Amino acid sequence: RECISIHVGQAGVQIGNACWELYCLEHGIQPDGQMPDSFNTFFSETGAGKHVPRAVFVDLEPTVIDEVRTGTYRQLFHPEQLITGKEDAANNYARGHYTIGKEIIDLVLDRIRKLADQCTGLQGFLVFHSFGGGTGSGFTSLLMERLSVDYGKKSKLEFSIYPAPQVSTAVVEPYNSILTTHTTLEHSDCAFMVDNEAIYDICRRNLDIERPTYTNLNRLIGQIVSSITASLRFDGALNVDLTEFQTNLVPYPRIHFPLATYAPVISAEKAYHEQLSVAEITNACFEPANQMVKCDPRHGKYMACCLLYRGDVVPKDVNAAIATIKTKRTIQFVDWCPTGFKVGINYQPPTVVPGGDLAKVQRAVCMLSNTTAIAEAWARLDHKFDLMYAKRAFVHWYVGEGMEEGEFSEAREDMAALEKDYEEVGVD
Amino acid sequence: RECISIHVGQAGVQIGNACWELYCLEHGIQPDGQMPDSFNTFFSETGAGKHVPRAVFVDLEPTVIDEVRTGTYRQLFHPEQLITGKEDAANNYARGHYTIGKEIIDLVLDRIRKLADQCTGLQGFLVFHSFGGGTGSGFTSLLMERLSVDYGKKSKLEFSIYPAPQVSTAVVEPYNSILTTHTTLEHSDCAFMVDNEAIYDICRRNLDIERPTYTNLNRLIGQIVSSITASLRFDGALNVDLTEFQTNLVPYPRIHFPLATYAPVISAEKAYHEQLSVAEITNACFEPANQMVKCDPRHGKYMACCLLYRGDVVPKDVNAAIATIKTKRTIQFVDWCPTGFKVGINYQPPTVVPGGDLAKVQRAVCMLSNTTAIAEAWARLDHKFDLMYAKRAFVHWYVGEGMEEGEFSEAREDMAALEKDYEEVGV
Amino acid sequence: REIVHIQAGQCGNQIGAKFWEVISDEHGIDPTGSYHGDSDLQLERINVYYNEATGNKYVPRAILVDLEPGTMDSVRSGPFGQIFRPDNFVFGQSGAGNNWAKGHYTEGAELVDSVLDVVRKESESCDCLQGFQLTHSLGGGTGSGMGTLLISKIREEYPDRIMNTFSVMPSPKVSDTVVEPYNATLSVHQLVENTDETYSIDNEALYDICFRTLKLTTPTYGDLNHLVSATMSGVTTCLRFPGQLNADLRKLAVNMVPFPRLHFFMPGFAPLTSLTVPELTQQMFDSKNMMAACDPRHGRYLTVAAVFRGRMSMKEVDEQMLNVQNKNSSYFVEWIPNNVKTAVCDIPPRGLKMSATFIGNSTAIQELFKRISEQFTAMFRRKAFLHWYTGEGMDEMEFTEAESNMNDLVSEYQQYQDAT
Amino acid sequence: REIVHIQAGQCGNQIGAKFWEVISDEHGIDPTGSYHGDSDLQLERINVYYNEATGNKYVPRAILVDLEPGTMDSVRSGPFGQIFRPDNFVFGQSGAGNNWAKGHYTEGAELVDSVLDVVRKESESCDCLQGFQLTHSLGGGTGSGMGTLLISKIREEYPDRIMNTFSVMPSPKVSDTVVEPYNATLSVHQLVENTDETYSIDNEALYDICFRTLKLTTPTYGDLNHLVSATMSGVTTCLRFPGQLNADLRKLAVNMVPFPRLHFFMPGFAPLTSLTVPELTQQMFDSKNMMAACDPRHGRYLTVAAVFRGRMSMKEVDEQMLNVQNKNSSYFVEWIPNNVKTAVCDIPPRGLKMSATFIGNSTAIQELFKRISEQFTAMFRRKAFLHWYTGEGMDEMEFTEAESNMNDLVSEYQQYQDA
Amino acid sequence: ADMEVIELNKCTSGQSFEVILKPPSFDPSLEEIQKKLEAAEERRKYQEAELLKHLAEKREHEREVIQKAIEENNNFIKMAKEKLAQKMESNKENREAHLAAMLERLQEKDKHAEEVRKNKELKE
Numbered sequence A: 001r002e003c004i005s006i007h008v009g010q011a012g013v014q015i016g017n018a019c020w021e022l023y024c025l026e027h028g029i030q031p032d033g034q035m036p037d038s039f040n041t042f043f044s045e046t047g048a049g050k051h052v053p054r055a056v057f058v059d060l061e062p063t064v065i066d067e068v069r070t071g072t073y074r075q076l077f078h079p080e081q082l083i084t085g086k087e088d089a090a091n092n093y094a095r096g097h098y099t100i101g102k103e104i105i106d107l108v109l110d111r112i113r114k115l116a117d118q119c120t121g122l123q124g125f126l127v128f129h130s131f132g133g134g135t136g137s138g139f140t141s142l143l144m145e146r147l148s149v150d151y152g153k154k155s156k157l158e159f160s161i162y163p164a165p166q167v168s169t170a171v172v173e174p175y176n177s178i179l180t181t182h183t184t185l186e187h188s189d190c191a192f193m194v195d196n197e198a199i200y201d202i203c204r205r206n207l208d209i210e211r212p213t214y215t216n217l218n219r220l221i222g223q224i225v226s227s228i229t230a231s232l233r234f235d236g237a238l239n240v241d242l243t244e245f246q247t248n249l250v251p252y253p254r255i256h257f258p259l260a261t262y263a264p265v266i267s268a269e270k271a272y273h274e275q276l277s278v279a280e281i282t283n284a285c286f287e288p289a290n291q292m293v294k295c296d297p298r299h300g301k302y303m304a305c306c307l308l309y310r311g312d313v314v315p316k317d318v319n320a321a322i323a324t325i326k327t328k329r330t331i332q333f334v335d336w337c338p339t340g341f342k343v344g345i346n347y348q349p350p351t352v353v354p355g356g357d358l359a360k361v362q363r364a365v366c367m368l369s370n371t372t373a374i375a376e377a378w379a380r381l382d383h384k385f386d387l388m389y390a391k392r393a394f395v396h397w398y399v400g401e402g403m404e405e406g407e408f409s410e411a412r413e414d415m416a417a418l419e420k421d422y423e424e425v426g427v428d
Numbered sequence B: 001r002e003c004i005s006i007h008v009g010q011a012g013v014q015i016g017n018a019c020w021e022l023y024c025l026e027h028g029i030q031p032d033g034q035m036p037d038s039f040n041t042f043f044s045e046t047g048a049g050k051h052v053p054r055a056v057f058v059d060l061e062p063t064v065i066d067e068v069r070t071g072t073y074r075q076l077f078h079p080e081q082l083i084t085g086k087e088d089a090a091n092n093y094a095r096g097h098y099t100i101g102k103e104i105i106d107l108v109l110d111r112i113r114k115l116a117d118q119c120t121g122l123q124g125f126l127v128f129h130s131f132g133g134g135t136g137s138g139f140t141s142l143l144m145e146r147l148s149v150d151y152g153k154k155s156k157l158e159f160s161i162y163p164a165p166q167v168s169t170a171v172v173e174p175y176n177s178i179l180t181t182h183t184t185l186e187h188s189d190c191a192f193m194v195d196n197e198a199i200y201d202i203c204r205r206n207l208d209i210e211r212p213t214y215t216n217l218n219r220l221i222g223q224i225v226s227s228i229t230a231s232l233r234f235d236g237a238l239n240v241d242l243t244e245f246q247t248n249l250v251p252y253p254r255i256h257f258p259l260a261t262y263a264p265v266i267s268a269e270k271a272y273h274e275q276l277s278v279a280e281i282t283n284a285c286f287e288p289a290n291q292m293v294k295c296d297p298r299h300g301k302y303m304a305c306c307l308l309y310r311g312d313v314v315p316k317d318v319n320a321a322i323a324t325i326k327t328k329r330t331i332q333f334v335d336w337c338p339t340g341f342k343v344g345i346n347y348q349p350p351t352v353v354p355g356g357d358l359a360k361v362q363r364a365v366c367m368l369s370n371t372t373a374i375a376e377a378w379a380r381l382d383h384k385f386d387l388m389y390a391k392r393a394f395v396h397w398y399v400g401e402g403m404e405e406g407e408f409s410e411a412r413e414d415m416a417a418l419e420k421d422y423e424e425v426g427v
Numbered sequence C: 001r002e003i004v005h006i007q008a009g010q011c012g013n014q015i016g017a018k019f020w021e022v023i024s025d026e027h028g029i030d031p032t033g034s035y036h037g038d039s040d041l042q043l044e045r046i047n048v049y050y051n052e053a054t055g056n057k058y059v060p061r062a063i064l065v066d067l068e069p070g071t072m073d074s075v076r077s078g079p080f081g082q083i084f085r086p087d088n089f090v091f092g093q094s095g096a097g098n099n100w101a102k103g104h105y106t107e108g109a110e111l112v113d114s115v116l117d118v119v120r121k122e123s124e125s126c127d128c129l130q131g132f133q134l135t136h137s138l139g140g141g142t143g144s145g146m147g148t149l150l151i152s153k154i155r156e157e158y159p160d161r162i163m164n165t166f167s168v169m170p171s172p173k174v175s176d177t178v179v180e181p182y183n184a185t186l187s188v189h190q191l192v193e194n195t196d197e198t199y200s201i202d203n204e205a206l207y208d209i210c211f212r213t214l215k216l217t218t219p220t221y222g223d224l225n226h227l228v229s230a231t232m233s234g235v236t237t238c239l240r241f242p243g244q245l246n247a248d249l250r251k252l253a254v255n256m257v258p259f260p261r262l263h264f265f266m267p268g269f270a271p272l273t274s275l276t277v278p279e280l281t282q283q284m285f286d287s288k289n290m291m292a293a294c295d296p297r298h299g300r301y302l303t304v305a306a307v308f309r310g311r312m313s314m315k316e317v318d319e320q321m322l323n324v325q326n327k328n329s330s331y332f333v334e335w336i337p338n339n340v341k342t343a344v345c346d347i348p349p350r351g352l353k354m355s356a357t358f359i360g361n362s363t364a365i366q367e368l369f370k371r372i373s374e375q376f377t378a379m380f381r382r383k384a385f386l387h388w389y390t391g392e393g394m395d396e397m398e399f400t401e402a403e404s405n406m407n408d409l410v411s412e413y414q415q416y417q418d419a420t
Numbered sequence D: 001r002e003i004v005h006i007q008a009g010q011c012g013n014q015i016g017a018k019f020w021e022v023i024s025d026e027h028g029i030d031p032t033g034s035y036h037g038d039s040d041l042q043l044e045r046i047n048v049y050y051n052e053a054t055g056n057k058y059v060p061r062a063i064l065v066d067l068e069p070g071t072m073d074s075v076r077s078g079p080f081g082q083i084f085r086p087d088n089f090v091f092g093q094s095g096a097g098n099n100w101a102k103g104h105y106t107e108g109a110e111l112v113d114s115v116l117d118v119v120r121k122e123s124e125s126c127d128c129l130q131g132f133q134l135t136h137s138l139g140g141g142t143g144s145g146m147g148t149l150l151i152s153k154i155r156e157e158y159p160d161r162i163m164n165t166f167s168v169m170p171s172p173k174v175s176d177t178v179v180e181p182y183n184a185t186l187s188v189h190q191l192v193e194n195t196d197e198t199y200s201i202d203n204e205a206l207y208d209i210c211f212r213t214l215k216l217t218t219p220t221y222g223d224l225n226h227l228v229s230a231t232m233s234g235v236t237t238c239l240r241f242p243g244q245l246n247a248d249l250r251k252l253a254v255n256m257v258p259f260p261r262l263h264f265f266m267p268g269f270a271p272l273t274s275l276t277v278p279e280l281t282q283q284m285f286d287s288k289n290m291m292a293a294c295d296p297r298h299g300r301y302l303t304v305a306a307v308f309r310g311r312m313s314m315k316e317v318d319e320q321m322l323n324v325q326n327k328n329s330s331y332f333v334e335w336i337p338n339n340v341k342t343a344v345c346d347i348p349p350r351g352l353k354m355s356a357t358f359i360g361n362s363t364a365i366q367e368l369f370k371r372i373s374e375q376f377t378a379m380f381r382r383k384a385f386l387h388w389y390t391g392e393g394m395d396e397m398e399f400t401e402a403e404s405n406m407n408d409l410v411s412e413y414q415q416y417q418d419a
Numbered sequence E: 001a002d003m004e005v006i007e008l009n010k011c012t013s014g015q016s017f018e019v020i021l022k023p024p025s026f027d028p029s030l031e032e033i034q035k036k037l038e039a040a041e042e043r044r045k046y047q048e049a050e051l052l053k054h055l056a057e058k059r060e061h062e063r064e065v066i067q068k069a070i071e072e073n074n075n076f077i078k079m080a081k082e083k084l085a086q087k088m089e090s091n092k093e094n095r096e097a098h099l100a101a102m103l104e105r106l107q108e109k110d111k112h113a114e115e116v117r118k119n120k121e122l123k124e
């Protein structure tokens, strides 16, 4: 049935800001809320006329959320659902989770709960937050604990922004990532990682943007994120309830992390070119250069596959397409599965923000796969993290907010265990 | 003196249904019971006008007996004498004999006894039932037990319908046959088997009915059955009363089973043809193709013979006919008998159901013989039975109604002993 | 004499509705009302499937169960939607889950009573109740999961009466859940314990039939549900028509099932899509024309029941049948004697002038179980998605208990490719 | 979100005033009034540095402290003198002494309260107060001496908020107190203990820059304060402009300081006096162009922050930066990964179309401490002018305590030229 | 042949006789048992009353499972609710001492000025 989005902290807020705009464009909802079940899974018909999103926006500084209540979409949300906390998290999980976090978590949880109240069968939450950075890692962690206390069964899907050096602020990023990913783990259900490097790299090879914005990256993410929710926003074939959606992707309580690969990313201005075949875009999905966590899956193994087509498409094609993906490519499925490919088709074509960078496309794909190759992004972090921590590099900033030194030890102890898990799902 | 017919379960009901209609036609009794001792042995003169049959009809589903109380002959029987039980026997002796049987047997026996009360010298019972099939095998068995308790001497003659594959429902048919024939054996006196295959086969060679009905078969059986009772219905020596059957046909308490062979079966439409000689129809009797349990008696031996002629006939002929049957045929009598042929003549000509398949005939015969060839039908069954039981094939359906697995063992043990008996009466 | 119809879960209801609107045209019933058609026979055994209500009106004896509204409102706002009585529907509201455990334990046992409550007032309203037939998917959750519990709860309320299931044993090709083998194995266990007959309908088979032999390019659940509806109406006919041989549901059972466990009938149909008698028989007795994916070559017949349809000279019919089981004599088991009965009913199905259908209790069915079981041990081996069930309250070794129970069933079907 | 500015002692005030009249021209503020300029950006983060008063008026958030009138009246009767609020000034009246002890104990603690009383009513008047920055000399007394006490008293009233200092570490050449090393060592001790970042500005450096590479014959405190004002406006930009990265002060701290002790950022500037991007980067990353006299060869970088200025194609900027730390790869420490962030802000400084500035936490800074400490043990060895402090109430071994604390700091910077 | 038809009986509507043709050539039903018809009901009234008490078994397992998921989701909360609230009174307790150990450090260097200014008023 229902579905609450929670956006925590700048990255999360701005990613959100940029797909609620896309949801609005998809469902014909004008910025003022008015539009002349279904998409009801995400919007609540409040009063007579309006269509407010089932969302809460939380940041610990004003600034970002403040920009939301300033420029159109200003009237989209309700004033309350946008929460801001005066002082920063200053780029450290400890501050975020404990020190400044403490103060605002009672207001957030108590407000989320007001949305929960207006849901005749609330289904789960969609949390959007950065991996690096302060409130993104810190406050999210604490939210997710207390959420797991306040909403038992109710699923929790997360959209994590995995940090990449070029478009990044803090040096202590790795600590924050490893710190949260640990605390958060036994509280998430399935988690979609987004490698900022990949999203930036796609914008450079594909859109030809010399050096992309955050709003450049964001619009792309918005699309990948829409493509995922899509299934349960209109009513489209399978992946058709939050349990059943992921009952598909995750074979083991840990191993949350599906790899997202989005179909035709083709720069507006090229719009009037020849439209790409259902076979050609399917093939795009099995090309690392098109991925979304920079890794390499003709290396690890697949334990789940899941093509999610959007736009006008017939199964006769998707089937006949899948055939030649197997022939002239790397099948590479682990020991103890089928050779899956759950196919979902959503006839409602992809929309694009009209002033944006990418063109209107006829047909898109989304290929979500639980591959052991993602583990690579778990090392590239752990390596950084070890190599600083080996010297206590910035640890004293955390101990300073009253965090135990052994809480670093222990989170890294888990990231090892995970890296172990992921490698131990090969061969039998 | 008197004589109660009991028809149990579809097959039996419908065979019955089709010979009471013939008894009625023979004795001038209109379907309403009216007619403008003798045939008193079978009908009672209830109130002033009517002539209701001495019969009880029992089935465990309604359906069949229901049809009786719907279509003319509706008023023939008395409402009570038609008994029905709501739930089926679902094709298994165990259900019939034990499970659903239990409930209805106290009413049946208690009702049969009301007919018994009417009878100043009741003579015995004629039970009509299927060999295969549920209530036919099952409920009869239990009836026959309790009958042998409630009516000591009183004879019991049975008309069994021996199952044949083409006109038949259940796969478990053999079990039910062997199961009952065992339980029923020390309780019957003489038993007339009817091979549905034979009766179906006669309909095809003789009547040219491409694929016969039950009602097709039934009318023929009606005739063979009438031919047997005839003796006790009209009165005229040779089986004038149940006891004589046993006396003439059965030499050993076991060996119950006489072979019936009926005379001219000739399709109406041929009616106006030349009438067949007393010699020609006597000869018919010694032709397997005209039998009634498919076996072969120029193979086994005769230990009793008994020609029952109907219609206008003089002994000088039957005698002189029998002469040439001996000469150009197979005598084949066992060691320790006469070479019998008890002849019975009933001047009252054969009648036929007017819309029916066979024509009005001048003279018919019936040749009832206790031959050891019938034993063949006992094997053809036992073979089926063994061959399923060897794997418990459907046994669990019986054990399920609370029957002992060793009760199968033990019934087959008897069917062996019988097949033994029958072969040990040679030489 | 009178059977009620439980129809539970998405696949169950989709099959069920098409089944209903197929027999209501065979019998001749309006969307709402009753008779309109120049035939006469129909109404004799309409007793069996239609508890008839006030006025003229016929209303099918049906319970519609689901664990969420969606696919039920589908049925109401559709074909013969106005036909089933209002509070004979049972909405789940909650998650179905595509998770056996949920349908059999948690979210299921939530409903269960409300269902039983209607199966009661339908059944307790029969003159002499035959038993129940349920239709449902075997993979997935609301049908496969609650259903097995429903039947587990019916036997107990009616030990007494017999139990029927059209169950759609599921396939990798045309399917929508990695977990189906888990859901199926869990049910196949239950079925073995609580039914008297189960008609195994392979979605694998169906698909093949449309694309192996039908030129149908993209098989919907549409032009594939169609085959089942036709198969189901054939299989039933004698329960609902003139009726002497089989036809009595228990009689069918006593005749089709030698051994308590082996009640897995694989069905088969005449001509297809949306004919001479010999050709009709060579088709209805064909691998390429069975409703369960398994060639009845690798495996013999324990019992067959075949039922023909249409004014046709049956002199040729037994003649034909007899030939089949002489031509192909070796594949009918020797130790059950007259083990293949036939019957004819002269009222044709939709379109078709001539048709036939066949129920086979065949040890080729073994082939299907093995394949759903090979899928299952393939996952449970290193314990795949099991955690979805562990969490719903289930026990680890209960999966090991189902697998093992069903492995026996393979080992029995095998056992009875025996000898005289 | 809002920082107050303590500016204490002669060198403190001289630097401070020039700093102020430099950013008020960057932001576009009148001697008294407010905005006059066709730019738009400026005012977004004017919040940070200008507590704005009645009417239009902007008034800098500044506390002006000295221990004698002279150099304050200098500021009032001068450049942007009419800008600071009247009772934001604190006259000492008495001797400053050029004696740390005097400024930190006797004649200093005399004032201290009156100062804290204004830092309070400024700070207790912020929306969310960031922290404080103080400018002052490190040798000599009123700035170096009272200042360290001021900061010692601020942390305590605000443990909480973070602590900033542009401090001018002094030199034999250009100075006239024999005692400076005493005054410097005594403070360097204090700084290590009570700041979160300190921008080390070497008057040695400055001098050289004007005479080593500027042809400036006689360097005043004039054409030498100039370099500091430019450096200081550079260093701050992100605190006061677009708001990409750093800009937070605590954020700057969490990113610049690996280890609680080592917060000694040595700064560096683009072009000089009173330009292509590559050349701009080869200059801003040059020994010959550091604000602290110590060539960042002999010593590696713990963290760098660089900030560029002017409408310039930053495709070339990261590209350039990336190259720097590859062509000079060995001098960035391996164990702190992405340890040199960069940012750009497109509003130029005075004159200059293009500019850049760099903050570097470098172990080359070790070089500076050693030289002020070699000066110090050179005197204290046979106890030189010590009697000036002994007398003011101080203890003998407290000098030994400061030297020793600061000798550790050398021994740590060294320690982290590691592996 | 060699007939010898010895006519046993003539009737109103009949006539019997036998034609012996050739010489011969040689020389407790018990009521008791329905202590068997109700002993067979003993077998059913039992083996059906078992596949019913193997069903009150299968049921006392639903009751078992349905309340395990609740007993162990109940377990998640009142384990990993207080796994946090005692991991926040470790933080609060920790940092508080870190700030108040940084003050009893700092006052101690201000009670130094009070003890070395008093050094001036006693050494003039």
Ligand SMILES: Nc1nc2c(ncn2[C@@H]2O[C@H](COP(=O)(O)OP(=O)(O)OP(=O)(O)O)[C@@H](O)[C@H]2O)c(=O)[nH]1
Pocket: A008, A009, A010, A011, A012, A014, A015, A059, A060, A061, A088, A089, A090, A091, A130, A131, A132, A133, A134, A135, A136, A137, A161, A162, A163, A164, A167, A168, A169, A173, A196, A214, A215, A217, A218, A221
């Ligand atoms: N894709 C994307 N990543 C972002 C965006 N904004 C920040 N990030 C990333 O997020 C990480 C830092 O987290 P932030 O969201 O900025 O910090 P925060 O604690 O959540 O918010 P603050 O209160 O501003 O500190 C870095 O890795 C950035 O690369 C954004 O708009 N889009």
Ligand SMILES: Nc1nc2c(ncn2[C@@H]2O[C@H](COP(=O)(O)OP(=O)(O)OP(=O)(O)O)[C@@H](O)[C@H]2O)c(=O)[nH]1
Pocket: B008, B009, B010, B011, B012, B014, B015, B059, B060, B061, B088, B089, B090, B091, B130, B131, B132, B133, B134, B135, B136, B137, B161, B162, B163, B164, B167, B168, B169, B173, B196, B214, B215, B217, B218, B221
């Ligand atoms: N000759 C003849 N045989 C019949 C007739 N009806 C059934 N049969 C045979 O009888 C056997 C089946 O016996 P049924 O009388 O149907 O069994 P039942 O349990 O007594 O009857 P139900 O109560 O309907 O179950 C099969 O061997 C059939 O071949 C009939 O009308 N005439």
Ligand SMILES: Nc1nc2c(ncn2[C@@H]2O[C@H](COP(=O)(O)OP(=O)(O)O)[C@@H](O)[C@H]2O)c(=O)[nH]1
Pocket: C008, C009, C010, C011, C012, C014, C015, C096, C097, C098, C137, C138, C139, C140, C141, C142, C143, C144, C145, C168, C170, C171, C174, C175, C176, C180, C203, C221, C222, C224, C225, C228
């Ligand atoms: N024949 C046919 N099979 C179906 C249909 N719907 C689902 N199935 C099959 O049943 C399995 C899952 O059944 P589903 O109905 O989703 O389970 P439910 O939650 O109990 O309703 C899959 O393998 C499908 O192939 C249907 O419409 N027709």
Ligand SMILES: Nc1nc2c(ncn2[C@@H]2O[C@H](COP(=O)(O)OP(=O)(O)O)[C@@H](O)[C@H]2O)c(=O)[nH]1
Pocket: D008, D009, D010, D011, D012, D014, D015, D096, D097, D098, D137, D138, D139, D140, D141, D142, D143, D144, D145, D168, D170, D171, D174, D175, D176, D180, D203, D206, D221, D224, D225, D228
């Ligand atoms: N950069 C710079 N350094 C100065 C200036 N004035 C003094 N200094 C240095 O600071 C030290 C003494 O500073 P001063 O401000 O006079 O100490 P005060 O008594 O606290 O005011 C000497 O070593 C000088 O080199 C100045 O105006 N600019």
Ligand SMILES: [Mg+2]
Pocket: A009, A088, A089, A090, A091, A092, A133, A134, A135, A136
């Ligand atoms: Mg933050």
